[PDB]
Each structure stands twice: as structure tokens, then as C-alpha cells.
Curated annotation (Swiss-Prot):
Zn(2+) 2 binds at residues 47, 50, 70, 75. A zinc finger (B box-type) spans 4-46, 47-89. It is found in: Nucleus. Induction: Expressed with a circadian rhythm showing a peak at dawn. It comes from Arabidopsis thaliana. This is Zinc finger protein CONSTANS-LIKE 2. Zn(2+) 1 binds at residues 4, 7, 27, 32. The chain holds residues 13 to 102 of 347 of the full protein. Belongs to the CONSTANS family. Highly expressed in leaves. Expressed at lower levels in stems, flowers and siliques. Not detected in roots. Transmembrane segments: none annotated.
């Protein structure tokens, strides 16, 4: 798994575009509790397939938030995966 950019001792779980940062859950809380300005940052779950990119699609059938590339790889695999309905997370 991609490491947290601040603590570099835990797997990242969220991605913050404004900070351009992959963060584990505790570092995410510490960074955005710092003040009201930071607390407005919108964050997204890190892809649960590759765990190295921000997720862009939620697939409830797979119970997985996936980045664009993992979403395409997983759902082109075969005709059952191809019918999965995903929710754009934007
Ligand atoms: Zn961390
Ligand atoms: Zn942020
Ligand atoms: Zn991915
Ligand atoms: Zn799926």
C-alpha cells in the first residue's frame, strides 16, 4: 500500500487534492482539525484495489471504492463484472 505522506508509518486511507497528500486516518484528522480553513478540504477514499490512487467510483456490488484505472480493469474482466453499476464519487 502507498504510505501516508506525513507519518510514513501507516497505509494511506484518504487523498486530499488541496494538499496533494495521501494520508492515513489519524494524519488526515490532525491535518484538517488544524483550523477552519483546512477543515473545509474535501477528501476521498484511497482506491481499495491498488491502494495507491484516489478513488473515483463506488461499486456497491464489490463493496469497493476504486480509482479510474482500477474501475476500468475490474469491470472489463468478464460479463458479470461488466454489468456492475457504479456511482461516480464526484
Ligand atoms: Zn499518517
Ligand atoms: Zn487537505
Ligand atoms: Zn486503483
Ligand atoms: Zn463492481
Amino acid at each position: 500500500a502507498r504510505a501516508c505522506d506525513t507519518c510514513r508509518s501507516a497505509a494511506c486511507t484518504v487523498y486530499c487534492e488541496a494538499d496533494s497528500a495521501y494520508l492515513c486516518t489519524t494524519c488526515d484528522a490532525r491535518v484538517h482539525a488544524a483550523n477552519r480553513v483546512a477543515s473545509r478540504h474535501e477528501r476521498v477514499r484511497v482506491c481499495q484495489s491498488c491502494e495507491s490512487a484516489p478513488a473515483a467510483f463506488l461499486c456497491k456490488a464489490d463493496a469497493a471504492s476504486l480509482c479510474t484505472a482500477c474501475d476500468a480493469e475490474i469491470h472489463s474482466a468478464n460479463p458479470m463484472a461488466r454489468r456492475h453499476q457504479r456511482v461516480p464519487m464526484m
